[PDB]
Structure 1
Amino acid sequence: GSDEEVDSVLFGSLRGHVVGLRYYTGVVNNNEMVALQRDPNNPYDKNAIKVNNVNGNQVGHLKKELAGALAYIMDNKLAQIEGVVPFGANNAFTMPLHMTFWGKEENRKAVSDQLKKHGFKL
């Protein structure tokens, strides 16, 4: 259970750039935290990660390139990608995202392999 899966070590922090903001509003709280979820519906793009902040707005979304790496780590729950917005979404346009990446030694090989192979983080 949670003693296995929630128990994860820090990989570090990853830098991203959310294109999905300008979809509807591109507004959040000045220091939000965004949760990365996989496809909420998207049939042919199951890779497409639907990002939603802890306020409850589905404001963020990855591109098929960015999501194309993290999709394996997301769907199979190989590691945790926890997003945070210190920028506050001052503009509706694309801003730097700060994702603090967690995961376990066992999965680190497969995860890091995909991260350097595809070369995409968000």
Structure 2
Amino acid sequence: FQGGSVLFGSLRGHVVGLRYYTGVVNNNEMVALQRDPNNPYDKNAIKVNNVNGNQVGHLKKELAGALAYIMDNKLAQIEGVVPFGANNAFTMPLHMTFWGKEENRKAVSDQLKKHGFKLGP
């Protein structure tokens, strides 16, 4: 991110599979996205860890299909925050912002679009 980066925009989503992990998350805290390409159920898998690096859950397969290519090619940095419901039991909401270089803005938006997503303000 050399001569800086720009906001491509934002996306809301869900951390799922909560019941299988014990990673604690507090409201309005950063979570981290971490690719799990070797995942047996899905090559696009993306784990969601708390700031300490304990697994909290996974992104839903549709969002993961959308984002995997973007993380793999470093087309954008993704910042995720759990805005509310961090103590939910099955799923938790997840706010995302996408940042990167101007010249990758279209690469990013096409990748999202072909998987059914569009960044917003």
So what's the TM-score if we normalise by structure 2? Answer: 0.81
Structure 2 residue aligned with 1:14? 11
Which of the pair is proportionally richer in helix? 1
For 1:23 and 1:121, the matched residues in 2 are separated by: 30
Q: CA deviation at 1:43?
A: 5.2
For 2:67 and 2:32, the matched residues in 1 are separated by: 13
In structure 2, do the counterparts of structure 1 residues 63 and 35 end up closer, same or farther at CA, with 3 Å as the change threshold? same
In structure 2, do the counterparts of structure 1 residues 92 and 118 end up closer, same or farther at CA, with 3 Å as the change threshold? same
Q: CA deviation at 1:20?
A: 3.0
Structure 2 residue aligned with 1:111? 108
Structure 1 residue aligned with 2:34? 37
Identity %: 100
Unaligned regions of 5+ residues in structure 2, if any? none
Root mean square deviation of aligned Cα: 2.3
Q: CA deviation at 1:12?
A: 2.1
Q: Figure out how many residues of one structure are paired with residues of the other and give that number.
A: 115
Q: CA deviation at 1:34?
A: 0.9
Indicate conservation of the 8 Å contact 1:38/1:48, yes or no: yes
Indicate conservation of the 8 Å contact 2:85/2:93, yes or no: no
Indicate conservation of the 8 Å contact 2:15/2:59, yes or no: yes
Which of the pair is proportionally richer in strand? 2
1:52 to 49, 53, 69: 49
For 1:28 and 1:110, the matched residues in 2 are separated by: 32
SS at match of 1:59: strand
Q: CA deviation at 1:96?
A: 1.8
SS at match of 1:17: strand
1:41-87 Cα shifts (integer Å, max 9, x gaps): 42563310111121322102113221111010011111111101121
1:82-108 Cα shifts (integer Å, max 9, x gaps): 101121512121122111211211111
In structure 2, do the counterparts of structure 1 residues 121 and 53 end up closer, same or farther at CA, with 3 Å as the change threshold? farther
